[PDB]
Each structure stands twice: as C-alpha cells, then as structure tokens.
Amino acid sequence: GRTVVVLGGGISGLAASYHLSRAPCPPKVVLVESSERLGGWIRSVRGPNGAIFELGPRGIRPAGALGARTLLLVSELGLDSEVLPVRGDHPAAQNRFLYVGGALHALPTGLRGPSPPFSKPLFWAGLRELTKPRGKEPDETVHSFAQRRLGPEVASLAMDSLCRGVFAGNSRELSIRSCFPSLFQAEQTHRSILLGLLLGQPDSALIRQALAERWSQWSLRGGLEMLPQALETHLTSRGVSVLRGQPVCGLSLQAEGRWKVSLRDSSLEADHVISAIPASVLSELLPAEAAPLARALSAITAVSVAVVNLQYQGAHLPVQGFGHLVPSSEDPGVLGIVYDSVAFPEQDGSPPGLRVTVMLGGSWLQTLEASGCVLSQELFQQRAQEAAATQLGLKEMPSHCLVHLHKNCIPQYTLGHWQKLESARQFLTAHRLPLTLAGASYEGVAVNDCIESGRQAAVSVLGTE
C-alpha cells in the first residue's frame, strides 16, 4: 500500500493525478480541491444563445515538444472529434496587432523589414543586436534586457506589450531568465539573441495534422473546459479519489515520515504530496520546521486579471486577426483584446454574434486593489466597453456581457525567481521531504507548461517507492 495526495484540482493537479493513475503499478491517489469545481483557471461558460465564453485560456499552441505532449494527451483522452483548430491559412493565425497612437498596427510577420509605430528598422535594430554585449548578471528584467539589446522602441512597444499579453505583468519587474528562457539562453550561449535562435516531440495523428495544416492554436468545441472535464472523468474511472469543496488547511510530518494532510474537519495520510496549488498558499500550509521553504514560496506572488467577454449583434471588427495588445504607455488597465470570433466562428452561438474578450489588469487594477475602491462589476464592464469603443470602433452597446475578476491568477516571475526555486528545491532535497512542486507558480504559466509540470511530478513520485 502507498498513498499519494495531490493538492489542487487545476490543470496541473489533474495532469499529475492522471499520470500517476496510468502507471503500471499505481499508488492510491487522492486529489484534493478547495473549490466546488476542478479545472482552476480553465473555465468555459455556455451562454444563453449557445455561444462559448472562455474565462481563462481560450486556445493552446501546438508548437514545440510541450505542445506535442499536450496533443498526445488529447488523443489519449479521446477528444479528437472535439478539436477546433486555427489553420495556417487564416488571419487569426497570421495577424497580431498593437494599439498605439490612436490606431491598430500589424506586427511584422515574415522577414518584411518600414513598419509603424516603429521609427525605422527592425532590420537595423536586429543588426546591432548581433554585436551587443552579453549580460553578466545572473538575471535581468525583461525591460532592461530588451532596451539594452533591442533599443527603447522595441522595449517600450514590443516587449512591454508581450509581457502583458503573456503574464499580464510589468516588464520592468519580470525576469527575462524565467519569463523568456529562450531569449536569455540565446544571449548567454551564443552571445546574440538572433544569432542564437538561428543556431538552434512525441507523435500522433493530431500532431501530424497540426504540422501539415500549420495550426497556430486549437481549442475544443464545447469550450477548453472539456479538457479538465475529460481528465476528471478518466480519474473517477480509474478509481482515483477526488475531493471537492475541501480546502487543505495544514501539512505536517509524523510517524515514519508520512505526511498528515489536514482538511477542515477531516484528515488524510500521504506517503508523498504533490502540491499543485499556488506557492503563496502552500507557503502557509507548511509546518514550523519548513520555515525556510515557506519563505521561498511566499516570495512568489501573482497579479489579478479582470476578464470581460463582450458580444455584439451585427457588428464587425476594423481588421481581422488574433487580437491586439495595448502597451502600458497607452492604457495600464487594458492589457489587450482577443478577437474570439475570428479564431472560432463556430462558438458564436445562434443567432451568431461578434465576440471579443477584453483583459483588464496592470497598475490600474493593482492600485485599485490596494485602494479602498470597490472593485464592482460595473467598473470593469465600463472600462472594457470603452476600450472596445475606442480601440475597435465598436460604439454599439454590447448585447451580452460577462465580467469575472480573477484574483492572483497569473504568477509573476520577478528578478531572482530562479533563486526562489533553487532555494525551495535544495531545502526539499536536503531535508528529504516527501513533497513535490508543480503548477504555474514555478516553471511556466502556459497550460502546456502546467500539464508538463504535472507529468514531471508524477514521474519523479513514481520513481520513488
């Protein structure tokens, strides 16, 4: 007999529980979720008119080894017939925009480089980049890194916007080493980003089709939530114990180095624990003897994001594309807008209606959260509608609106994040604690990364017995 408890029923926790239960000689697995539902930030709402409104991720990229692993999981879960891809022969896969100076500007795609809002090169900017010195510090902020090797314009207009689109965060506080590993390694190793990227994967039917059709992203017909739903179904089917509505309240070691997972008014013993909850939360569950680990984990915080889904009957966008990003110099509060209907017309409902999703956050939301201002649904709906009106020419009143304030939903990998992870890792091994870390708080926030962190936790835990 052997029991493994997984804390957190988000995509990372589900992936870990899934891989543990698929092993040849699986241990007893118990997945403990605090809320009434599994899936974490992956959540889909089915509107009155039949349209799908995503409240978190709304598509997954198949590129790279991780994207391939995720598609392999989709096949194993038998979700093939539900896959909705955005094929390479569409504008949602070949067009990203930046809203700057009262207008939407297409970002350079191919080698075409003569491109507003940029002054002159992108030929020239990348030219002096190949000759730019190599940073000698163990870490650097994205902004500093960007301005030093790419210039002020690329830093303020491109990297600033990209950090908001991926991490809903501030490039002046985010780590290049942790947030854009590839760019950091390129510079350190080859001494040049471009030069380094030029020097430079499971298999399945879906993966082959994704490559042949050049998918930029994919989702699922009834909403991305179908993914955690399928995982949950398979777990219950494999005899895995899933507890919902039961937040973990404490962790402590006892007889024969077994964990004591304390719930509200219940308790569970575990030979090993896989923590797939936010680092700040685990930090508080740890016993007194793990104070150093708790301190390393508490240093990892997350920003909030307010998601506003807007639908318009009979309206159209100024341009066709994936969506657009908004630099912090344009509007701290409006991170960007995704053109959901361009990518997935099949989820527009009937009668079909134009759908866009406005992501709010930045210093605007942070200062309000820190202030006594009541974060009402009205405030977010108003700012989102105004953003759509000004940035997309959609002055019409939305026919449907959904507002969700997601508290501390995207971990921020700030300067020194790598050392917070190193410290936690060394404490765990040095004290031989039967605890493994997984999820967005550590090695990546993307769903592909979270799934992989869950799989890796399962592998390391199964190896030990």
Question: Which C-beta is closer to ligand FAD: that of 12 or that of 385?
Answer: 12
100 is in an annotated binding site: no
- CA-CA distance, 279 to 349, in Å (whole number)? 38
- CA-CA distance, 263 to 34, in Å (whole number)? 10
Binding of ligand FAD at residue 305 (CB under 6 A)? yes
Q: Work out the angle at residue 376's Cα, subtended by the Cα atoms of residues 371 and 382, and round it to the nearest 5 degrees.
A: 110
Binding of ligand FAD at residue 445 (CB under 6 A)? yes
Binding of ligand FAD at residue 440 (CB under 6 A)? yes
Tell me which of ligand FAD, ligand ACJ, none is bound by residue 7, counting a contact when its beta carbon lies within the kind-specific cut-off of 5 to 8 angstroms.
ligand FAD
Binding of ligand FAD at residue 8 (CB under 6 A)? yes
Picking from 418, 386, 438, the residue whose alpha carbon sits closest to that of residue 282 is 438
Binding of ligand FAD at residue 59 (CB under 6 A)? yes
463 is in an annotated binding site: no
41 is in an annotated binding site: yes
- CA-CA distance, 302 to 294, in Å (whole number)? 16
- CA-CA distance, 222 to 204, in Å (whole number)? 23
- CA-CA distance, 334 to 235, in Å (whole number)? 39
87 is in an annotated binding site: no
9 is in an annotated binding site: yes
Strand order from edge to edge, sheet including 354-360: 103-106, 96-100, 323-325, 334-338, 354-360, 302-312, 400-411
Question: Which C-beta is closer to ligand FAD: that of 56 or that of 362?
Answer: 56
Tell me, residue by residue from 18 to 47, as one string, x for binding to ligand FAD by CB under 6 A and - for no binding.
--------------xxxx----xxx-----
Selected binder of ligand FAD within 155, 300, 358, 450 (CB under 6 A): 450
78 is in an annotated binding site: no
Work out how close the CB of 283 gets to ligand FAD at its nearest, in angstroms, rounded to a whole number.
11
Binding of ligand FAD at residue 341 (CB under 6 A)? no
Query: Of 251-280, which residues contact ligand FAD (CB under 6 A)?
Result: 276-277
Work out how close the CB of 7 gets to ligand FAD at its nearest, in angstroms, rounded to a whole number.
5
Amino acid type, 97: F
Question: Which C-beta is closer to ligand FAD: that of 130 or that of 249?
Answer: 249
Question: Which C-beta is closer to ligand FAD: that of 9 or that of 327?
Answer: 9
Tell me, residue by residue from 183 to 202, as one string, x for binding to ligand FAD by CB under 6 A and - for no binding.
--------------------
Residues lying near ligand ACJ in the complex (CB under 6 A) are found at 96-97, 164-168, 305, 322-325, 335-336, 338, 359, 410
How far is the first Cα of the chain from the last one, in angstroms, to the nearest whole number?
10
Question: Which C-beta is closer to ligand ACJ: that of 226 or that of 303?
Answer: 303
Question: Which C-beta is closer to ligand FAD: that of 122 or that of 251?
Answer: 251
223 is in an annotated binding site: no
Work out how close the CB of 13 gets to ligand FAD at its nearest, in angstroms, rounded to a whole number.
6
Work out how close the CB of 361 gets to ligand FAD at its nearest, in angstroms, rounded to a whole number.
9
Amino acid type, 462: L
What residue numbers does the annotated binding site for FAD cover?
8-13, 33-34, 41, 56-59, 248, 440, 445-447
Binding site for ligand FAD (CB under 6 A): 7-13, 32-35, 40-42, 56-60, 247-248, 276-277, 281, 305, 307, 406, 409-410, 439-440, 445-448, 450
